[PDB]
Design a protein around this ligand. Structure first.
Ligand SMILES: [Mg+2]
Ligand SMILES: [Mg+2]
Ligand SMILES: [Mg+2]
Ligand SMILES: [Mg+2]
Ligand SMILES: [Mg+2]
Ligand SMILES: [Mg+2]
Ligand SMILES: [Mg+2]
Ligand SMILES: [Mg+2]
Ligand SMILES: [Mg+2]
Ligand SMILES: [Mg+2]
Ligand SMILES: [Mg+2]
Ligand SMILES: [Mg+2]
Ligand SMILES: [Mg+2]
Ligand SMILES: [Mg+2]
Ligand SMILES: [Mg+2]
Ligand SMILES: [Mg+2]
Ligand SMILES: [Mg+2]
Ligand SMILES: [Mg+2]
Ligand SMILES: [Mg+2]
Ligand SMILES: [Mg+2]
Ligand SMILES: [Mg+2]
Ligand SMILES: [Mg+2]
Ligand SMILES: [Mg+2]
Ligand SMILES: [Mg+2]
Ligand SMILES: [Mg+2]
Ligand SMILES: [Mg+2]
Ligand SMILES: [Mg+2]
Ligand SMILES: [Mg+2]
Ligand SMILES: [Mg+2]
Lengths: 53, 44, 118, 92, 109
RNA sequence: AGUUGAGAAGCUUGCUGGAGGUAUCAGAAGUGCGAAUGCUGACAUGAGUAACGACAAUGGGUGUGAAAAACACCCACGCCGAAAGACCAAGGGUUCCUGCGCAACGUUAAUCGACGCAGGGUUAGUCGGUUCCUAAGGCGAGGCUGAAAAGCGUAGUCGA
RNA sequence: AACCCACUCCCGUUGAAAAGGUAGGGGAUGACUUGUGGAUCGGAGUGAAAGGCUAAUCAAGCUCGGAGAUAGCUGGUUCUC
């Protein structure tokens, strides 16, 4: 179906109040001091102080 | 699902061609009107 | 409903799902390291481990049974000759899964599957 | 005629196929006038280069249409000829 | 303080707000880390803008890369390219291909 | 922004603007838009929602590259095979091949392309046209017919 | 079976498609099907006849002029006191 009246700025912006981002699962490698996602192989290829690739 | 326009060249020239229009009197008037309007093609 | 049902479809039919793991194992037993998707790696550990366990007993029947499900001469040769003797005293746990970032094109959680000793 | 000998050959055609033909075989590629026949272009090479040609093969090449903001512009058409010389003589 | 702009970016304006508000008011040390592992397309563009902004402060000024804090981030809307898309029963609808202007501003205070 | 009139409205200055404006009084109007499912450009809500085009099928390794699910090669898988294979006639008109590239498209990215720039590439006594002949049919000297345009038609010459 | 046609269910209705698709269906040596060329045109043609078809338009097409037809009928008609 279609609408009978357009939604105003307040009504539109209220809907997208629950639309945010969060990925703060970072961790610092003990050896290389490289930032990486937790429980993930680091971009260089180290996981808990061990080269794997 | 045959559409209305099935292209051809021999049929196109024998109907809408320069010699087809120039042969009859009405087609010559069409040529004169199309030239007076100043169209670039004049023959389709 | 899925109550205590094991196995994930991966949006593939049964034959594609079977043939995909059959071709993932045969590739894993050539390179010993694969960059694959994490859900595909969580299911690959239920296919390669039975083959590695089967490889610990060399026999005509065992080699034929292995070939029946990982059909490749090179993989059967790699088994029963290098694998199954290296892991002759390791009870289970023949490979590990290490998550590795996300895919570039899509966002698919990737994971490295690696044999435990290499 | 005295003319129609300095107007049938428009010059050599430099290429990779033409270069390979000149070396492997005794065929030379030329840009010829669009209204030039096979008889004119064999009596012109023998006159202006002092050689002997066994036969000539000709083809008409269409011009590439280049699109630019203003319409589609067609490049000039031209004719090409493979002047096949005798085992001796070279069309330089 | 120094600024950096990207006038004309393929991603639309609305999608890039959700990354801009995620880093508005943080330090550049972790602002680059949040976008280094964010999963959205806007993160790659915005990190390219942020590193250029940091390099501008480093070169044109004596500001160290440690004390900088991203102060002002706003994503405007740029030119939208209009193209048609055929649909059912002959009807054709118009499709806009939006862009945005990203302005990351860092301050050494 | 301030201020003056019942009102239409008028007056003075901050900033921007960077070259013309017309005390007062009279004329001449294309003379004052909120609506005509009004006409033309721009921008919204729907909404970051539906869809991304058949349910042949994809999984690894190497290379390049700033960046690989889609680019190249190798291994292995699936599909068509009276076609998803080859060759002609229409039709299209360089989309064919090689270098330099991805601002745009390609329903996503792209190092790739039927995409942009620059070059190259179609060779005939024997294969198809032209040249010879004619069918349906077109035109048609003379000639009949018709207010005029023009219609019919013989000799004739065009038409695969 | 190719080929032609379109009897039934479902899907689709902003569709892959301005009339299609998966299943099933009728004819398939003839009143057959089809490639190329040609003839019949607007109160005029064709029609195993539905008022069907005549370039997605048909109880008489498309385009240009009479023409800014006519509308005792809708709608709209803009500054102040
Ligand atoms: Mg005809
Ligand atoms: Mg089956
Ligand atoms: Mg020829
Ligand atoms: Mg020209
Ligand atoms: Mg259509
Ligand atoms: Mg002046
Ligand atoms: Mg007015
Ligand atoms: Mg208005
Ligand atoms: Mg819209
Ligand atoms: Mg989505
Ligand atoms: Mg909704
Ligand atoms: Mg939904
Ligand atoms: Mg959806
Ligand atoms: Mg598709
Ligand atoms: Mg098959
Ligand atoms: Mg068959
Ligand atoms: Mg082109
Ligand atoms: Mg090509
Ligand atoms: Mg794209
Ligand atoms: Mg190209
Ligand atoms: Mg005749
Ligand atoms: Mg006649
Ligand atoms: Mg006569
Ligand atoms: Mg003849
Ligand atoms: Mg057919
Ligand atoms: Mg049948
Ligand atoms: Mg019709
Ligand atoms: Mg009127
Ligand atoms: Mg009148």
């Amino acid at each position: 179906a279609v609408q009978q009246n357009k939604k105003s700025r307040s009504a539109r912006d209220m809907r997208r109040s629950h639309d945010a981002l969060e990925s703060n699962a970072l961790s610092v490698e003990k050896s290389t001091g490289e930032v990486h996602l937790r429980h993930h192989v680091s971009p260089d290829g180290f996981y808990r102080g061990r080269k794997v690739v | 699902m045959k559409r209305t326009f099935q292209p051809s060249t021999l049929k196109r020239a024998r109907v809408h061609g320069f010699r087809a229009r120039m042969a009859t009197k009405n087609g010559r008037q069409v040529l004169s009107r199309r030239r007076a309007k100043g169209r670039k093609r004049l023959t389709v | 409903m899925r109550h205590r049902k094991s196995g994930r479809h991966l949006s593939r039919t049964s034959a594609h799902r079977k043939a995909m793991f059959q071709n993932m194992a045969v590739s894993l037993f050539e390179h010993e390291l694969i960059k694959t998707t994490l859900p595909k790696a969580k299911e690959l550990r239920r296919v390669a481990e039975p083959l590695i366990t089967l490889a610990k007993e060399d026999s005509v029947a065992n080699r034929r049974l292995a070939f029946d499900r990982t059909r490749s001469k090179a993989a059967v040769g790699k088994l029963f000759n290098d694998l199954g003797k290296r892991y002759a005293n390791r009870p289970g746990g023949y490979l590990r899964i290490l998550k590795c970032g996300f895919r570039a094109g899509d966002n698919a959680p990737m994971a490295y599957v690696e044999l435990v000793d290499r | 005629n005295q003319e129609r000998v300095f107007k049938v050959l428009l010059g050599p055609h430099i290429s990779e196929k033409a270069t390979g033909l000149a070396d492997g075989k005794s065929q030379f590629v030329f840009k010829v006038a669009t209204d030039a026949t096979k008889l004119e272009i064999k009596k012109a090479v023998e006159s202006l280069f002092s050689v002997k040609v066994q036969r000539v093969t000709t083809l008409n090449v269409k011009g590439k249409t280049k699109r630019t903001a203003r319409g589609l512009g067609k490049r000039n058409d031209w004719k090409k000829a493979y002047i096949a010389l005798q085992p001796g003589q070279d069309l330089d | 303080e120094v600024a950096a702009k990207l006038s004309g970016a393929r991603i639309s304006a609305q999608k890039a707000r959700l990354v801009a508000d995620q880093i508005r008011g943080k330090k550049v040390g972790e602002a680059l880390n949040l976008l280094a592992f964010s999963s959205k397309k806007a993160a790659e563009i915005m990190k390219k803008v942020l590193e250029s902004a940091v390099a501008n402060a480093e070169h044109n000024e004596g500001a160290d890369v440690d004390d900088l804090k991203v102060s002002t981030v706003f994503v405007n809307e740029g030119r939208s390219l209009k193209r048609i898309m055929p649909r059912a029963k002959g009807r054709a609808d118009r499709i806009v291909k939006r862009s945005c202007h990203i302005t990351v501003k860092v301050a050494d205070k």
